[PDB]
Write a structure and sequence with these properties.
The PDB classes it as oxidoreductase. This protein is α/β, with parallel strands linked by helices. The protein contains eleven helices and 13 strands. Strand 6, helix 5 and strand 7 form a beta-alpha-beta unit.
């Protein structure tokens, strides 16, 4: 049988692109997408049937929706991420912890296969930052990461105690042409693409040799669907590292220079993202994902850069190459 899929937190970047991919694969009638607010006027989800307002902090309203829709799969995606959560920790705990609590209880009660993402922010400086393993010391330096260590462990206990089919990946940095860049931990990368198209200096807040694991969004979407399709018996764990490729800001600059055939002006002035990024892995070991459920990626850094420099003009109006 084909799934009936509920997505919560659908107005995040991942949630939007995943929502659209699930509608495309399974049909709109089989997917229900929700968020605490309505999509913006020009948002990809605006005006679509099967898009609803749900406050997942209201456990009774969350239950009511799940009871009515009868999902077989849920992607529980609400999140307050690293930079934002350091300044708004109470909201981060509400969103990252309490809505997850409710989601897991609903998955138990209503027999739902439940995806809740984790993050490389779950790691800190004791992780072993070269080819970081799936099992290692977790000492996150952000309250986002703190909350996701707890999600990983609580979901895994729900699997052990009740047989809840809980699945998760530790998302690396996720690059998308749709991203509106600001002060996010990985937003330097998006700024650097924008500066290149604008032909303006980029002041990068992450230091030139600070490597991080990254993925291009099309690859992420493929993996998020694949892990949920996999037979349970093939999964040896609940929580998997997944990666595309690692890069540092200096390596991204060279990729962009190769793709534009221009010199790109970058200066480095450390900002808050650096301290956060330096506590994260340089690269991930994703072998368990590859072997258990066939995680794979199509894009490398130059293929990504050629597509980003095409798509940003289309989506944001910036000058083409």
């Amino acid at each position: 049988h084909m799934p009936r899929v509920l997505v919560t937190g659908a107005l995040g970047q991942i949630g939007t692109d995943l929502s659209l991919a699930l509608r495309d694969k399974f049909g709109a009638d089989s997917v229900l997408v929700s968020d605490v607010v309505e999509p913006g006027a020009k948002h990809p989800l605006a005006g679509l049937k099967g898009v609803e307002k749900l406050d997942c902090l209201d456990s009774n309203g969350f239950e009511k929706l799940v009871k009515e829709f009868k999902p077989t799969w849920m992607y529980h995606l609400p999140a307050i991420m690293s930079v934002r959560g350091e300044a708004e920790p109470d909201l981060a705990m509400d969103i990252n912890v309490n809505t997850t609590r409710y989601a897991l209880e609903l998955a138990r009660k209503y027999n739902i296969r439940i995806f809740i993402p984790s993050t490389i922010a779950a790691f800190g400086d004791k992780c072993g930052k070269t080819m970081t393993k799936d099992d290692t010391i977790m000492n996150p330096s952000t309250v986002y990461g703190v909350t996701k260590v707890y999600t990983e462990l609580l979901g895994t206990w729900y699997r052990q105690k009740y047989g809840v089919d809980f699945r998760s990946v530790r998302l690396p940095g996720i690059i998308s042409a749709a991203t509106l860049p600001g002060g996010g931990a990985t937003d330097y990368a998006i700024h650097m693409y924008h500066s290149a198209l604008l032909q303006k200096k980029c002041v990068c807040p992450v230091l030139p040799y600070e490597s991080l694991p990254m993925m291009y969004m099309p690859d992420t979407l493929n993996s998020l669907v694949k892990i949920m399709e996999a037979p349970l018996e093939k999964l040896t764990r609940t929580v998997y590292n997944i990666t595309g490729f690692s890069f540092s800001p200096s390596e991204l600059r060279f990729s962009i220079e190769r793709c534009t055939d221009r010199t790109i002006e970058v200066e480095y002035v450390e900002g808050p993202a650096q301290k956060i990024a330096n506590s994260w892995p340089d690269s991930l070991d994703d072998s368990n994902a590859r072997n258990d459920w066939g995680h794979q990626v199509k894009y490398d850094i130059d293929m990504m850069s050629e597509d980003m420099l095409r798509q940003i003009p289309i989506l944001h109006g910036l000058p083409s190459l």
